[PDB]
């Protein structure tokens, strides 16, 4: 399929824009002519080993999801319709805006301001604690996976960094991308999430279920704080030096259950603070309290709740209910 700006799908369906192409296939935007116009994303899938099962996953789990929730209330994706398409699956959902990864990415790698973290924050936690309650983990927890629901914005000329800058009308977003979502019952892949997002007992085999979203969302929060990937490897004995160097050694019940011993030697992690990797280390992760811009209430308020979030231990972890009161949220009430 070519997609051409002006193609028509199932007569209803007319492309006006292609929003990204991967390696699956494409999204398009499209206007929805049944439905009098309104415009949706249609996320047209190569219906291929390599790509089908996702689709297919992601539609079981949003039928569900629409049954349980239909007005969409719980900021989790609503898609609207599926079909066949000469060798693709086509997944027509509401559209959204860019994802909270684009939106920092074209705006130079700036963070957001604390007051739409807030925001945000409730929000994915708010959706991610929707699928926790009905027996589900995300597994793929991203900001590449959080959509603005519009990408409306302001202009102001920012005199610090020598150019316009935008700024979100509305920062109100969407979870999306289901397609990784494993109910409690089923098989549960032994990895799961994207390298940088992913928690400690994923990587260590221990077993994961809810608790791995959290780490996720913690990830996700410091990352909108200050703009950059704090876990920026491939590679996991450094990723597991990565996270000793901002939350402290791994609890040592960890390593000693896992298999994994490769990374240990004597029950620490084998890693040289001092060789070349272990100095990169030290120079590209801190303390976790380090990273703080300012040692306002808020920010000491969103910096507990990232550690809680950010707790090794999956056990320990704080739950996405608990989080939902924690007192950084207090001003939203
Ligand atoms: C269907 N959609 C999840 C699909 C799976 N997924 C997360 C991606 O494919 C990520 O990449 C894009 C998602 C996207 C639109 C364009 C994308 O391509 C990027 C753009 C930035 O430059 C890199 C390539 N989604 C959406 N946009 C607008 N409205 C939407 N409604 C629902 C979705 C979506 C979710
Ligand atoms: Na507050």
Same mark, same amino acid.
């Given at each position: 399929l070519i997609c051409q700006s002006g193609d028509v799908l199932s007569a209803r369906y007319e492309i006006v824009d292609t929003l990204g192409e991967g390696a699956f296939g494409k999204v398009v935007e499209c206007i929805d002519h049944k439905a009098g116009g309104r415009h949706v994303a249609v996320?047209?899938?190569?219906?291929?080993d390599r790509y089908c099962e996702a689709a297919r996953s992601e539609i079981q789990v949003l039928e569900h999801l629409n049954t349980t929730d239909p007005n969409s209330t719980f900021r989790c994706v609503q898609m609207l319709e599926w079909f066949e398409h000469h060798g693709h699956i086509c997944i027509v959902f509401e559209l959204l805006g860019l994802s909270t990864y684009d939106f920092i990415k074209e705006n130079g790698f700036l963070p957001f301001r604390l007051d739409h973290i807030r925001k945000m924050a409730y929000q994915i936690c708010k959706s991610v604690n929707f699928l926790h309650s009905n027996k589900? %983990? =995300?597994?793929?927890?991203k900001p590449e996976n959080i959509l603005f629901v519009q990408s409306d914005y302001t202009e102001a000329y920012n005199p610090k960094i020598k150019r316009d800058e935008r700024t979100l009308i509305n920062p109100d977003i969407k979870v999306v991308d289901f397609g990784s979502a494993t109910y409690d019952d089923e098989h549960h892949s032994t990895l799961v999430s994207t390298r940088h997002y992913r928690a400690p007992e994923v990587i260590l085999a221990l077993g994961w279920s809810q608790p791995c979203d959290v780490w996720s969302i913690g990830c996700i929060l410091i990352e909108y704080y200050?703009?950059?990937?704090?876990?920026? %490897? =491939?590679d996991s004995k450094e990723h597991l030096a990565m996270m000793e160097r901002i939350?402290?050694?791994?609890?040592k019940h960890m390593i000693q259950k896992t298999?994994?011993?490769?990374?240990?030697h004597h029950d620490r992690?084998?890693?040289?603070?001092?060789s070349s990797a272990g100095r990169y280390v030290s120079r590209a992760c801190?303390?976790?309290?380090?990273?703080?811009?300012?040692?306002?209430v808020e920010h000491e308020r969103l910096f507990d709740l990232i550690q809680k979030m950010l707790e090794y231990d999956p056990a320990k972890r704080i739950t996405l209910r608990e989080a939902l009161k924690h007192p950084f949220f207090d001003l939203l009430k």
């Open positions: 996320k047209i899938v190569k219906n291929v589900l %983990t =995300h597994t793929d927890l200050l703009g950059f990937t704090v876990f920026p %490897t =491939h939350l402290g050694p791994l609890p298999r994994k011993r490769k990374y240990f992690l084998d890693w040289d603070e001092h801190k303390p976790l309290k380090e990273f703080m811009l300012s040692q306002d």
